[PDB]
Design a protein around this ligand. Structure first.
Ligand SMILES: Nc1ncnc2c1ncn2[C@@H]1O[C@H](COP(=O)(O)OP(=O)(O)NP(=O)(O)O)[C@@H](O)[C@H]1O
Ligand SMILES: Nc1ncnc2c1ncn2[C@@H]1O[C@H](COP(=O)(O)OP(=O)(O)NP(=O)(O)O)[C@@H](O)[C@H]1O
Ligand SMILES: [Mg+2]
Ligand SMILES: [Mg+2]
Lengths: 309, 309
């Protein structure tokens, strides 16, 4: 079977898997689905699913998309649809697959930092829900393993740490800021933290107000090039973005005040690039001990792959 | 002992209690504390606390206030400080008190909608942490009981419902939208929902951007009076607020699509007035079965009082 590692996040589903020839592929797919089939009169291609006697369709523009920011989204029908759609648009041949998926830190672990067995099993069972697609066959999910978010992204680093050092893993997602503090060699977890009131979406929504999702996203990724901005549009948007970024940074730095005793720091998630500078400065962590990739939104799923593949 | 009912929310702490003479009092106190004593050279009055060998002070203006939007805030040192400060500014005489406090729906209950016993006990034990105040004595918390959020606010109504009807309780807080669907006579809970990516703060922050916290709060509460706006300031702020409100409404209505089979609807929390209209319209719930007070931010703590007092 193909083995697919899946970071099913509330913004995008990230996939990683190894091809027959040993080539490693990554994939990303939005999770925007409405609880209704999409109608095409001939122009658009549509992905119309049925899950539990309910219609779903991929829809990246309707405002009536199903919410994905609630806690129980991890165990929802629409999550299952989102994962099947990701598989279906990945380029993998339709087939039986084993998967490894994630639960957010505060779902994977209980408030005593021990694995939450009931949540883990609920996550596995969710993918037994049966799905159909109009005008095509669907992947068949077989074995399901569950990992926590965060930890796998830091594991390659954790292997190099003294059992006594501890890595601070800072994950700024689209809708959440989650942080773990983990003992070297993954000998234990000293602290877990989850705050769903801040994510990249703060900045995206701010920019959007000053003014699709793409325009704002493009404006943000190209904030360092003045000609792109002037070109892409027709000074206000700019100030708004900088204030959003400023407020984002302020709150992230506030959050870090909840942690101490860490010797190493790593920043992951799609928002890593937006707070990287402010986090390095504030932590005063000597650079050899500060970790950030150039593909931050895939750090988790890559770490999962290196562990479980 | 005085018995104090406490809704310790991430924005404000709400208190309710009965006086010796049977008079019912309510109180509200912000939860903004920095992990450091506040310095007064003679002008300001300061509340400087020590919790676990750590300094805290009430601070409604410094940006470095301790975060209160993370999940574990319910079990934090700073929560304990916030509750003692609320008591201390309530007008109650300093003394030994029994209290009833709340856990959010998704902390009080596990993902199988059964009471989470470990979380409940962790909440009780939190108030055993010892606290001191500079230049004054602190209340002594004795017995602690814990109720869930939401349910108590709807209980007076639930008593009147057929065991077969079900009340949809919609709680828009400062940082969270939580919803329960409860069988009449509190015979059971059919569904629990928690989304921490939306709250009144969306609107408050939007207004603030268009431009203290008060100015934005005042602008919002008086959005229906054009002279107040013109007077309070020096058209932009207006459009921004209306777009924030519009987006708020859109997402709340999206959330309601996750629920069905309810015969009654109730809207509570500080944000109830901001979505009341859109919720009544969208639900198409006949008015005798739609419940909203004129003191929405105290609905929970009042319901707790009526139950436990
Ligand atoms: N280099 C970058 N600069 C700016 N934004 C980025 C960058 N890379 C990714 N993003 C965006 O950051 C957002 C968050 O990405 P991501 O962390 O993968 O979301 P998520 O995992 O699905 N959300 P969550 O459930 O809260 O953890 C997305 O909208 C990305 O497009
Ligand atoms: N009638 C009103 N109109 C507009 N805003 C209001 C009104 N009443 C209260 N608010 C505000 O709404 C916000 C949310 O209040 P509240 O629901 O009590 O917060 P909370 O319980 O502490 N937050 P949370 O932990 O997310 O549940 C506060 O900032 C209030 O000031
Ligand atoms: Mg993520
Ligand atoms: Mg509340």
């Amino acid at each position: 079977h193909h083995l697919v590692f899946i970071d099913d996040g509330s913004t995008n589903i990230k996939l990683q898997w190894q091809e027959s020839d040993g080539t490693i592929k990554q994939h990303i797919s939005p999770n925007s689905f409405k609880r209704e089939w999409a109608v095409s009169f001939g122009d658009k291609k549509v992905f119309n699913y049925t899950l539990n006697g309910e219609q779903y369709s991929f829809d990246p523009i309707s405002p009536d998309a199903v919410v994905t920011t609630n806690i129980a989204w991890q165990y929802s029908d629409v999550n299952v649809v989102a994962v099947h759609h990701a598989l279906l648009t990945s380029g993998l041949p339709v087939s039986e697959v084993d998967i490894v998926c994630t639960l957010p830190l505060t779902e994977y672990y209980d408030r005593n930092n021990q694995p939450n067995t009931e949540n883990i099993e609920r996550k596995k069972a969710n993918f037994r829900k049966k799905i159909t697609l109009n005008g095509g066959d669907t992947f068949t999910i077989k074995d399901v393993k569950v990992m926590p978010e965060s930890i796998p992204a830091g594991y390659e680093v954790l292997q190099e740490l003294d059992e006594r050092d501890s890595l601070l893993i800072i994950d700024l997602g689209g809708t959440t800021l989650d942080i773990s503090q983990v003992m070297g060699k993954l000998s234990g977890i000293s602290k877990i933290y989850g705050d769903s009131s801040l994510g990249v979406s703060l900045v995206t929504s701010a920019v959007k107000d000053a003014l699709s999702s793409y325009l704002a996203d493009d404006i943000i990724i190209h904030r360092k090039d003045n000609n792109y901005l002037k070109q892409r549009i027709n000074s206000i948007v700019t100030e708004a973005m900088n204030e959003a970024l400023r407020k984002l940074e302020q709150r992230v730095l506030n959050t870090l005040n909840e942690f101490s005793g860490y010797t190493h720091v790593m920043v992951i998630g799609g928002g890593a690039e937006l707070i990287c500078d402010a986090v390095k400065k504030h932590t005063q962590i000597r650079d050899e001990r500060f970790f950030k990739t150039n593909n931050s939104q895939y750090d988790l799923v890559n770490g999962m792959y290196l562990i479980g593949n």
